[PDB]
Design an enzyme around this catalytic site. Structure first.
Site, PDB file in Angstrom:
ATOM      1  N   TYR A  26       0.767  -1.340   0.044  1.00  0.00           N
ATOM      2  CA  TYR A  26      -0.075  -0.147  -0.056  1.00  0.00           C
ATOM      3  C   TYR A  26       0.733   1.195  -0.037  1.00  0.00           C
ATOM      4  O   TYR A  26       2.169   1.365   0.386  1.00  0.00           O
ATOM      5  CB  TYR A  26      -0.965   0.044   1.304  1.00  0.00           C
ATOM      6  CG  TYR A  26      -0.368   0.550   2.383  1.00  0.00           C
ATOM      7  CD1 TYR A  26       0.646  -0.382   3.266  1.00  0.00           C
ATOM      8  CD2 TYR A  26      -0.493   1.770   3.006  1.00  0.00           C
ATOM      9  CE1 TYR A  26       1.180   0.069   4.520  1.00  0.00           C
ATOM     10  CE2 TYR A  26      -0.100   2.168   4.280  1.00  0.00           C
ATOM     11  CZ  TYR A  26       0.723   1.418   4.878  1.00  0.00           C
ATOM     12  OH  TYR A  26       1.296   1.759   6.202  1.00  0.00           O
ATOM     13  N   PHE A  36       2.524  10.648   3.511  1.00  0.00           N
ATOM     14  CA  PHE A  36       2.338  10.252   4.874  1.00  0.00           C
ATOM     15  C   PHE A  36       2.847   8.720   5.261  1.00  0.00           C
ATOM     16  O   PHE A  36       3.625   8.602   6.049  1.00  0.00           O
ATOM     17  CB  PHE A  36       1.073  10.550   5.664  1.00  0.00           C
ATOM     18  CG  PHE A  36      -0.031   9.594   5.568  1.00  0.00           C
ATOM     19  CD1 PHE A  36      -0.759   9.688   4.196  1.00  0.00           C
ATOM     20  CD2 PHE A  36      -0.285   8.908   6.593  1.00  0.00           C
ATOM     21  CE1 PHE A  36      -1.759   8.817   4.295  1.00  0.00           C
ATOM     22  CE2 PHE A  36      -1.602   7.977   6.405  1.00  0.00           C
ATOM     23  CZ  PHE A  36      -2.234   7.796   5.126  1.00  0.00           C
ATOM     24  N   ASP A  37       2.239   7.751   4.533  1.00  0.00           N
ATOM     25  CA  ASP A  37       2.587   6.402   4.685  1.00  0.00           C
ATOM     26  C   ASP A  37       3.024   5.573   3.448  1.00  0.00           C
ATOM     27  O   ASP A  37       2.345   5.997   2.317  1.00  0.00           O
ATOM     28  CB  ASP A  37       1.208   5.610   5.229  1.00  0.00           C
ATOM     29  CG  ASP A  37       1.165   5.728   6.987  1.00  0.00           C
ATOM     30  OD1 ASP A  37       2.023   6.590   7.334  1.00  0.00           O
ATOM     31  OD2 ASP A  37       0.214   5.082   7.291  1.00  0.00           O
ATOM     32  N   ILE A  56      -8.232  -0.383  10.632  1.00  0.00           N
ATOM     33  CA  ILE A  56      -9.210   0.651  10.640  1.00  0.00           C
ATOM     34  C   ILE A  56     -10.515   0.195  10.002  1.00  0.00           C
ATOM     35  O   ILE A  56     -10.327  -0.477   8.855  1.00  0.00           O
ATOM     36  CB  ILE A  56      -8.993   1.892  10.521  1.00  0.00           C
ATOM     37  CG1 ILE A  56      -7.660   2.128  11.316  1.00  0.00           C
ATOM     38  CG2 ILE A  56     -10.201   2.851  11.378  1.00  0.00           C
ATOM     39  CD1 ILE A  56      -6.748   3.269  10.506  1.00  0.00           C
ATOM     40  N   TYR A  82     -10.440   7.607  12.539  1.00  0.00           N
ATOM     41  CA  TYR A  82     -10.045   8.552  13.342  1.00  0.00           C
ATOM     42  C   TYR A  82     -10.922   9.854  13.176  1.00  0.00           C
ATOM     43  O   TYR A  82     -10.047  10.833  12.734  1.00  0.00           O
ATOM     44  CB  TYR A  82      -8.509   9.030  13.353  1.00  0.00           C
ATOM     45  CG  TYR A  82      -7.495   7.500  13.371  1.00  0.00           C
ATOM     46  CD1 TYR A  82      -7.881   6.632  14.863  1.00  0.00           C
ATOM     47  CD2 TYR A  82      -6.849   7.073  12.741  1.00  0.00           C
ATOM     48  CE1 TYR A  82      -7.187   5.654  14.852  1.00  0.00           C
ATOM     49  CE2 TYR A  82      -6.043   5.767  12.769  1.00  0.00           C
ATOM     50  CZ  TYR A  82      -6.163   5.350  14.033  1.00  0.00           C
ATOM     51  OH  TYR A  82      -5.417   3.871  14.146  1.00  0.00           O
ATOM     52  N   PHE A  99      -6.035   6.134  -0.337  1.00  0.00           N
ATOM     53  CA  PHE A  99      -5.075   5.034  -0.394  1.00  0.00           C
ATOM     54  C   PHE A  99      -5.198   4.394  -1.883  1.00  0.00           C
ATOM     55  O   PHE A  99      -6.191   3.876  -2.299  1.00  0.00           O
ATOM     56  CB  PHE A  99      -4.948   3.701   0.665  1.00  0.00           C
ATOM     57  CG  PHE A  99      -5.073   4.270   2.050  1.00  0.00           C
ATOM     58  CD1 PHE A  99      -5.926   5.173   2.603  1.00  0.00           C
ATOM     59  CD2 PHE A  99      -4.130   3.734   2.895  1.00  0.00           C
ATOM     60  CE1 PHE A  99      -5.773   5.593   4.025  1.00  0.00           C
ATOM     61  CE2 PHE A  99      -3.885   4.075   4.418  1.00  0.00           C
ATOM     62  CZ  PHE A  99      -4.823   4.977   4.807  1.00  0.00           C
TER      63      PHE A  99
END
Lengths: 107, 872
Positions: A26, A36-37, A56, A82, A99
């Site tokens: 991913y 960020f990821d 999540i 979140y 994503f």
């Protein structure tokens, strides 16, 4: 409510259910165009299995609908990942997360 | 707020020479189309996405460089407003992603063919892939330039282009009316695959170039009375002698007599003389003679009538037995053996041929015919409709020596006739020296505009190199001094010269060497200048003009130097690379214009911020002090405040209770008295702005209409991507009272209607939500104190300071920090080349496959964002 758009066509043969380990290679990028990821930076595939409440709930239902060789695009609303404050230092509160996923192997 | 970074790719782009553009009377047809087939592309070799998309752009603004730019990094097509990129899921035009509603959508996988179709008069950019077109087009854009194919490829891409029908064969046959791309080729240029804005090539022993000069958009168009009585009958006699010169080379090669006219049968109806010519043939030579004598005094050539005996004493040419045909009649042309070829009028009859036949191109284009490398009489195609200096030399003397049978004949009649920018290549300032002695060379394989020598690390690229006191450079195209003037020293170049410069800073000697031989001045001294202070030290500098080749000889290994073992090796000089573990990275100027902050000690313009009163808020304005004499060159300034406002993401679809919930913020400008309101342009400009010309306006701004829909043809939504969402200050306007132009931004819905003097105007615009806009005005000042931004707010609208940052959004006190000051674009800056590039190569096997581009170098690079301006 999550919108899914495919990127590259895959199999359409195996989509996962409970009792199945899965690998997803991913990448993550917020709505204002910032990184960020990722797991590209790792040279590791991320390993988890569904139904362990690990990811999540905005990802745990989108990860059970895809197949082998399938690149998809999931735009998660802030209500499903979140909502109130979230992880400190990672995501500002009530920001959408986008994503672009790819399932590698293992059903 | 702060500065983040991540690893990013490298991109370059290859481009073939197909240049298509229009004007009023243009040489085009309007329909051209091509394909690209995809077979060898890696899925994911690098970290980020493989940047892979096709597109077309215009040559004036689109310029991909691997070092720097806007965005995150890795800018190819689709990353600007000039190009139209599309990878399979999103039509990229100006850092955007728009969803496309097609059945079975995917990216450019192998064993697929990707293309786009483009037409010229009415704008239409449709895309074609997998047998059915996608549902998304672009239109209503500005075409101030020419077209070109261009592709974007990351590391690990091998693709070939389906060129046409000549060197290819299209798998997908085009719709009727769409012509293939293979015939918009210039005749003396073979169809070449060369990268756009290149400054480096791989040679025999990495050589660097400059900008290739682009063909202008005012170059392809063809642009062009009294009757003297002393040249009336002789204008028909010149047509009769033209018929004689028509028949003289005709009877010697096979034109025979006949009542009919045929091409293969070689039958001439006009082989006897001009008197046996029919009426539609005689007025043809008469209208040619009438077209060619009227342009004598159109240039200024003084023609006089004298020497009436010499033309009558001149007889005809002698005729041999084999020079006359099987007809029994012979032409009698005038022998110009007493006439001499003049070099003065040899430069004028070279221009009169263009003067006589660009009106031919005028007249063929006004009938509606086009340009192609093939001719076709049902499709009104010809390779003839060209400007004369775009025409190849196979037609040059076949036109000029056919028309040169008249000009020396009128001489023998007795009638006498009377007659982008430059780049600077320099190292970084941390590699400079202050003691010792060093040396470089320069190999010049093309004699052109080279500047070789040394300069100072406080180099100002605003001034032309050689005119200020920061560089001591060498001229060789004319061969002299360039420092505070020009005075002769030295020799001209040769194609393949080796020239270098060394400095004994022990006693400030400047020595230039030419191929081992040292040059002396007019005084007899081999040294150039003395009395130089060291100060900050010297820097190896070089500069290359438009469209030449020349590289910098560093001299890392001693055997790679050729002409240092002849001169200067004994007396003590050494090359610059004495102890080098790595190649040097020499910086170079870019012709990409962008913004640079205002120095406080500027001799032309000043700005200052006011204090805070109750009646007038604390604001800023501009002032000019050197308005009067002593060479005050003033030009249109482009002011900007360097911080943006980003909008709300998904739209909604006095008393303190009504100001807290709404998101609208208003600011204005107020032009002072005595200034031209017609050249005041007020609004907001996005970061996608990399242009600078001296007389811009709102007719010269580009906006691309994006719309998508269903497969049946219905529309869904319409989108306008522009960069200049501004208005005209003279739209509603020695005025004695100042005038107000405002701009308000409603962040919740995104609609921006601008107000003037308390009343609303007509023009509205809307923008995509996740873009940003800088507050900017474009004003030419016509006196001293002109532009005055206001940091104010009226009784129902909050100021800009609330939408500035996060910590102050609901306090209505307007104050201006010194973080926000004015921003002015200067057309030159400094970027850096990396020490390892993309070694690209071109290959083709087969006659109908297409020339393939390859790459094999995996390369990534640490690049930053600086998100308060969005410049990688």
């Amino acid at each position: 409510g999550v919108e899914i758009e495919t990127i590259s066509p895959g199999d359409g043969r195996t989509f996962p259910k409970k009792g199945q380990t899965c690998v997803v290679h991913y990448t993550g990028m917020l709505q204002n165009g910032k990184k960020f990821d990722s797991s590209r930076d790792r040279n590791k595939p991320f390993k988890f299995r569904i139904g362990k409440q690990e990811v999540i709930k905005g990802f745990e239902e989108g990860a059970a609908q895809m197949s082998l060789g399938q690149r998809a695009k999931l735009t998660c609303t802030p209500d499903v990942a979140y909502g109130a404050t979230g992880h400190p230092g990672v995501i500002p509160p009530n920001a959408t997360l986008i994503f672009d996923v790819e399932l590698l192997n293992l059903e | 707020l702060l500065l983040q970074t991540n690893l990013i790719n490298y991109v370059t782009s290859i481009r073939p020479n197909i240049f298509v553009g229009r004007a009023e009377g243009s040489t085009q047809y309007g329909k051209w189309y091509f394909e690209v087939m995809v077979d060898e592309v890696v899925p994911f070799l690098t970290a980020q996405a493989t940047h892979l998309r096709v597109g077309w752009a215009l040559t004036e603004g689109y310029s991909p460089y691997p070092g720097g730019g806007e965005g995150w990094g890795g800018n190819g097509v689709g990353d600007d407003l000039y190009s139209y990129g599309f990878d399979g899921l999103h039509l990229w035009t100006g850092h955007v992603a728009r969803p496309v509603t097609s059945p079975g959508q995917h990216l450019l996988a192998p064993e697929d063919v990707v293309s786009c179709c483009l037409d010229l008069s009415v704008p239409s950019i449709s895309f074609r892939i997998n047998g059915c077109p996608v549902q998304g087009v672009f239109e209503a854009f500005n075409l101030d330039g020419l077209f070109f194919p261009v592709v974007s490829f990351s590391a690990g891409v091998k693709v070939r282009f389906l060129l046409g029908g000549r060197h290819g064969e299209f798998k997908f046959l085009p719709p009727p009316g769409y012509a293939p791309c293979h015939e918009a080729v210039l005749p003396r240029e073979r169809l070449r695959l060369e990268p756009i804005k290149e400054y480096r090539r791989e040679g025999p022993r990495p050589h660097l170039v400059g900008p290739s000069r682009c063909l202008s958009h005012t170059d392809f168009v063809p642009c062009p009375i009294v009757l003297p009585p002393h040249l009336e009958r002789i204008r028909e006699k010149l047509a009769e002698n033209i018929h004689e010169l028509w028949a003289l080379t005709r009877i010697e090669q096979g034109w025979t007599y006949g009542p009919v006219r045929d091409d293969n049968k070689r039958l001439h109806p006009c082989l006897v003389n001009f008197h046996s010519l029919p009426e539609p043939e005689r007025n043809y030579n008469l209208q040619m003679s009438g077209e060619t004598l009227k342009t004598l005094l159109a240039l200024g050539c003084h023609v006089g009538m004298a020497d009436e005996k010499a033309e009558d004493n001149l007889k005809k040419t002698k005729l041999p037995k084999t020079y006359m045909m099987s007809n029994g009649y012979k032409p009698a042309p005038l022998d110009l053996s007493h006439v001499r070829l003049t070099p003065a009028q040899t430069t004028l009859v070279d221009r009169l041929a263009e003067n006589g036949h660009n009106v031919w191109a005028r007249d063929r284009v006004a009938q509606g015919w086009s340009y192609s490398a093939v001719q076709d009489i049902p499709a009104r195609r010809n390779p003839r409709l060209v400007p004369y200096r775009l025409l190849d030399e196979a037609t040059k003397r076949s036109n000029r020596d056919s028309l040169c049978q008249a000009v020396r004949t009128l001489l023998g009649y007795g009638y006498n006739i009377e007659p982008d920018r430059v780049r600077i290549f320099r190292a970084e300032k941390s590699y400079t020296v202050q003691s010792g002695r060093w040396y470089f060379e320069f190999e010049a394989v093309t004699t052109g505009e080279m500047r070789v020598g040394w300069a100072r690390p406080e180099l100002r690229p605003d001034v032309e190199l050689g005119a200020d006191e920061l560089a001591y450079v060498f001229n060789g195209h004319r061969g002299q001094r360039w420092h505070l003037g020009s005075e002769p020293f030295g020799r001209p170049w040769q194609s393949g010269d080796v020239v270098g410069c060394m400095i004994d800073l022990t006693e400030n000697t400047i020595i230039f060497t030419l191929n081992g031989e040292v040059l002396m001045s007019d005084s007899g001294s081999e040294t150039a200048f003395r009395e130089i202070e060291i100060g900050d030290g010297f820097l190896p500098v070089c500069s290359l003009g438009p469209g030449q080749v020349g590289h910098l000889n560093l001299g890392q290994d001693v055997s790679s130097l050729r002409f240092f073992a002849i001169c200067g090796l004994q007396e003590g000089f050494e090359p610059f690379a004495i102890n080098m573990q790595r190649p040097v990275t020499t910086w170079f100027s870019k012709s990409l214009p962008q913004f640079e902050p205002v120095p406080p000690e500027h001799p032309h313009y000043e700005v200052a911020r006011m204090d805070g009163t109750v009646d007038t808020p604390p604001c800023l304005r501009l002032a000019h002090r050197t308005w009067g004499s002593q060479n005050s060159l003033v030009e249109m300034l482009f002011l900007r405040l360097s911080l943006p406002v980003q909008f709300h993401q998904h739209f909604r679809c006095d008393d303190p209770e009504i100001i807290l919930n709404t998101t609208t913020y208003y600011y204005s400008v107020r032009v002072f008295a005595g200034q031209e309101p017609s050249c005041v342009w007020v609004g907001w400009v996005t970061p996608d702005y990399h242009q600078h010309d001296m007389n811009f306006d709102l007719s010269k701004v580009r906006a691309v209409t994006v719309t998508m829909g269903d497969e049946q043809g219905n529309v869904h939504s319409s989108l306008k991507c522009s960069n200049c969402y501004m208005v005209w200050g003279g739209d509603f306007v020695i005025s004695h009272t100042d005038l107000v132009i405002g701009c308000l931004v409603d962040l919740a819905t995104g609609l921006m209607t601008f107000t003037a003097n308390g009343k609303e105007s007509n023009t509205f615009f809307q923008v995509e939500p996740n873009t940003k806009l800088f507050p900017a005005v474009f004003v030419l000042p016509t006196h001293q104190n002109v532009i005055q931004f206001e940091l104010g707010k009226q009784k129902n609208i909050m100021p800009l300071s609330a939408a500035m940052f996060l910590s102050e959004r609901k306090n209505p006190a307007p104050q201006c920090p010194p973080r926000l000051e004015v921003q002015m674009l200067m057309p030159v800056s400094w970027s850096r080349m990396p020490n390892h590039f993309l070694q690209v190569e071109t290959r083709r096997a087969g006659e109908r496959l297409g020339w393939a581009v390859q790459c094999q170098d995996p390369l990534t690079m640490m690049a930053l964002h600086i998100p308060e301006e969005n410049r990688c």
